[PDB]
Amino acid sequence: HWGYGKHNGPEHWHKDFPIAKGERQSPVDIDTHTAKYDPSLKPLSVSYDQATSLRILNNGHAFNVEFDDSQDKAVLKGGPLDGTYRLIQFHFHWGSLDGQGSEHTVDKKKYAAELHLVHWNTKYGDFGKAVQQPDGLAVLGIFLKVGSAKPGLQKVVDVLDSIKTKGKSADFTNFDPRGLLPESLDYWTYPGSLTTPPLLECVTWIVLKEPISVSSEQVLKFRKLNFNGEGEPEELMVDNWRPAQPLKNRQIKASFK
Ligand SMILES: CC(=O)Nc1nnc(S(N)(=O)=O)s1
Ligand SMILES: [Zn+2]
């Protein structure tokens, strides 16, 4: 089954998921000089004050923090979006070294990791229906660079020891995702896809310009997780990122000049 190894990594995915070679795949390189400023784009509206986190899970490819999405508690609106998108989970992609890890790149620059806050369009009723629609998901992408620690991330880092291996989960309540946002909400946006199988082309990507900084010690703890289940041979969970895909017939728009 698929993964990030030499024998099952992204270059192999198309054999089981032919849409991997599709017209609106993600991630992409953001060429800052070719992106188009669009004055018609609205500011993002992030309403996370009533967010209810439930659980943190190692699913064998990353760790996910899951939220209660049975009501409009944590929602994303505005920007390029029509309607209301509910937060369902966030996760990260990261590297084995500080010079790599992000999925998106900016003028070919890679960051140490990338945070994805995944939201689904409420008009489709559930997440499973949403992924079948071209406007079904909105994913907010935030870059991480190594520098000073991010206090708001430390609660996540401290629980990782309890979900070291695939399939382990832990109760993870009262986490406030607002502590993971940068100061500015300036963004680029383009139409794209999930970056893991099944690679469905259902995502409006919103990638923030401003990275957040985390400390070397914080990212080091991500790299101690395992792809494998308990009792299996240890494989460190690192480099769980898909390389940039061709832009083809898409334009990246910027909310700022
Ligand atoms: C269930 C779920 O959320 N699946 C996802 N697959 N890829 C995602 S990402 N890397 O594009 O945010 S989210
Ligand atoms: Zn992701």
Per-position DSSP letters for 189-220, written without gaps between them: EEEE--SSTT--S-EEEEEESSPEEE-HHHHH
The angle at the Cα of 113, spanning 49 to 208, to the nearest 5 degrees, equals 50
Amino acid at 212: I
Closest by alpha carbon to 145, among 182, 175, 190?
A: 182
Confirm whether residue 1 is marked as ligand binding: no
Please give the full DSSP string across 167-186, using - where no structure is assigned: T-EEE--S--GGGG--S---
Q: Cα dist. 186→71, 132, 181, 200, 251 in Å?
A: 27, 28, 12, 26, 17
In the reported structure, the alpha carbon of residue 121 is separated from the centroid of ligand 2 by a whole-number distance in angstroms of 17
In the chain, the number of structural domains is: 1
Residue 104 is a catalytic residue? no
**Catalytic one among 1, 61, 104, 119?**
61
7 known ligand binder: no
**Kind of pairing between the strands at 203-208 and 137-146:** parallel
CA–CA dist 116, 257 (Å, integer): 24
Residue 89 to residue 56: CA distance in whole angstroms: 9
CA angle, 73 then 78 then 83, to 5°: 65
Which residue has the least CA distance to atom 5 on ligand 1?
194
Question: Of all protein residues, whose CA lies closest to atom 11 belonging to ligand 1?
Answer: 194
Q: Is 14 annotated as a binding residue?
A: no
126: nearest Cα among 115, 117, 137, 141? 137
From CA 101, how far away is CA 211, in angstroms rounded?
A: 13
* Phi, psi at 113, each rounded to 5°: -165, 170
State how far the Cα of 248 lies from the Cα of 169, in Å rounded to an integer.
Answer: 39
Q: 27 C-alpha vs ligand 2 centroid, how far in Å?
A: 9
Residues 209, 149: contact at Cβ < 8 Å? no
Cα–Cα distances in Å, from 31 out to 143, 243, 253? 16, 15, 11
Burial of 73 (0-12, 13-18, 19+ CB in 10 A): middle
| Cα distance between residue 202 and residue 85, in whole Å | 13
Pocket of ligand 1 (CB under 6 A): 89, 116, 118, 139, 194-196
**Which ligand 1 atom sits closest to the C-alpha of 127?**
1
DSSP single-letter state for residue 110:
P
Tracing tokens 């997780």 back to the chain, one arrives at 225
Q: Is the distance from CB of 143 to CB of 133 less than 8 angstroms?
A: no
Ligand 1 atom with minimal separation from the 139 CA? 12
Contact assessment for residue 133 and residue 201, using Cβ atoms and an 8 Å cutoff: no
Task: State the amino acid at position 24 in one-letter form.
Answer: R
Q: Is 196 annotated as a binding residue?
A: yes
Record the tokens describing residue 219, joined without a space.
């990212």
Interatomic CA distance for residues 29 and 104, integer angstroms: 6
H or E stretch including 127? helix 127-130
As a residue count, the chain comes to 257
Q: Is 15 helix (H, G, I), strand (E, B) or coil?
A: helix
Q: DSSP letter for 153, please.
A: G
Pocket test for ligand 1, best of 4, 116, 206, 242 (most atoms within 8 A of CB): 116
Cα 56 from Cα 99, distance rounded (Å): 27
At CA 39, angle to CA 35 and CA 41, rounded to 5? 85
Can you tell me the distance from the alpha carbon of 70 to that of 125, in angstroms, rounded to the nearest whole number?
A: 10
The residue among 205, 75, 71 whose CA lies nearest residue 135 is 205
Do residues 85 and 78 lie in contact, with contact meaning Cβ atoms separated by under 8 Å?
Answer: no
- Contact between 54 and 232 (Cβ < 8 Å): no
Index of the ligand 1 atom closest to the CA of residue 26? 11
- The whole domain housing 89 covers 1-257
Handedness of CA 249, 193, 245, 20 (dihedral sign): negative
Name 141's bridge partners. Answer: 116, 207
Dist. CA 142 → ligand 1 center (Å): 14
> Could you report how far apart the first and last alpha carbons of the chain are, in Å?
44
Sequence-distant (≥ 6) Cβ neighbours of residue 199 within 8 angstroms: 13, 17, 19, 20, 22, 25, 193
| Single-letter amino acid, residue 137 | L
- CA dist 164 and 63 (Å) reads 9
* CATH code at position 35: 3.10.200.10
The span from the CA of 111 to the CA of 30, in Å, is 13
Query: Which ligand 1 atom sits nearest the alpha carbon of residue 197?
Result: 6
User: What distance in Å separates the CA atoms of residue 234 and residue 154, rounded to the nearest whole number?
Assistant: 25
